[PDB]
């Protein structure tokens, strides 16, 4: 009986080692591991015969549906288009922003003007919207 239990303990200890060098020492993007809320810092304390882990996590709430586009473009020059980085292009619903479209964070709803910091150039695609007038990122 002791031989069996000792072996299972060793395997369990290996798991703990893996979590300390992933889930604890750094943020992890793979999910599954850690708490079920994306991942943010976690902590570990001593416990009898083992380690006790605590995981801080992010839980989203109050989801809403919004209109969004695959990308935006200059209708006068279909040879340079853009797409958001780590966020989305959504139709504007905010009185502060005069722009037809706005950038948002992906973890939380929060509109912002579209700027080069939030975009990357991409090859053109048929599903991108054609903006024939005011698009500042790039203006040209």
């Amino acid at each position: 009986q002791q031989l069996v239990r000792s072996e299972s303990a060793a395997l369990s200890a290996q798991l703990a080692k893996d979590k300390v060098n992933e889930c604890v020492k750094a943020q992890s993007k793979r999910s599954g591991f850690c708490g079920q809320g994306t991942h943010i810092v976690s902590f570990v304390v001593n416990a009898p015969n083992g380690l006790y882990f605590m995981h801080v996590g992010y839980y989203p709430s109050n989801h809403i549906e919004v209109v969004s586009a695959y990308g935006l473009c200059d209708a006068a020059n279909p040879t340079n288009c853009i797409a958001p980085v780590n966020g989305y292009f959504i139709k504007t619903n905010n009185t502060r922003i005069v722009d037809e479209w706005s950038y948002t964070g992906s973890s939380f709803y929060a509109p912002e003007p579209i700027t080069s910091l939030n975009t990357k150039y991409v090859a053109p695609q048929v599903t991108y919207q054609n903006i024939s007038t005011n698009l500042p990122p790039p203006l040209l």
Partner: antibody, heavy 119, light 111 residues
């Protein structure tokens, strides 16, 4: 208690730029874009432009891009517009308005200034 | 922006009469089903007043008597209880595209 305060009317001579104001009251001024409209007749009105009061971003009717421009004094909670190069054809009743979304993704004029005029 | 027109150029009615106004667009205004249509009210000596929006026939500063209708290029405004103080010019407005133009309007009157 929202109100807009347009500046008084003037019989301005041609070739003179014309400045008009529309101070906000009863709300935080920086949270809403300002819109301007030109009324040359009760049957003839056209949009002039829009100005964000937080980012300073604008759009203009293409016909006025070489003409009127807009600014905001965030500490006076007021919006201003100035028409370059007045001509007799520019006499009009001018109206500022406050942006709103009574419907999702639909811009609406909401509150209106009492109106001002120039000739 | 899409061109807007309206008819009849003026309408006169008996008090408490139902009444409507036709409004047409040069191009359909529906985008993602949004419509973007606003109607306004104006009387001399005063600024225009927002009445309704394509999905708002109540609220937006008015009683439920102001019912917007239609889709695509055709729209209308319908009021079952017209009253003497409802006489005003009325204006369709398009929020779909810059310049954000709007119609010259029509005028309601009591006979």
């Amino acid at each position: 208690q929202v109100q807009l305060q347009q500046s008084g009317p003037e019989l301005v001579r041609p070739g003179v730029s014309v400045k008009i104001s529309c101070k906000g009251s009863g709300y935080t001024f920086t949270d809403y874009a300002i819109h301007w409209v030109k009324q040359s007749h009760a049957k003839s009105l056209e949009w002039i432009g829009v100005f964000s009061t937080y980012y300073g971003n604008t759009n203009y009717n293409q016909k006025f891009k070489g003409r009127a421009t807009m600014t905001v004094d965030k500490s006076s909670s007021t919006a201003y517009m100035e028409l370059a190069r007045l001509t007799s054809e520019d006499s009009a009743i001018y109206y500022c308005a406050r942006k709103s979304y009574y419907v999702d993704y639909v811009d609406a004029m909401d509150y209106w200034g009492q109106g001002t005029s120039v000739t | 922006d899409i061109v807007l027109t309206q008819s009849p150029a003026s309408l006169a009615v008996s008090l408490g009469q139902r009444a409507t106004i036709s409004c047409r667009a040069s191009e359909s205004v529906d985008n993602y089903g949004i419509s973007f249509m606003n109607w306004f009210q104006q009387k001399p000596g005063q600024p225009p007043k927002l009445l309704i929006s394509a999905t708002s026939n109540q609220g937006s500063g008015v009683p439920a008597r102001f019912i917007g209708s239609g889709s695509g290029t055709d729209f209308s405004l319908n009021i079952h209880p017209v009253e003497e103080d409802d006489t005003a010019m009325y204006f369709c407005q398009q929020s779909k595209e810059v310049p954000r133009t709007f119609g010259g309007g029509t005028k309601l009157e009591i006979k």
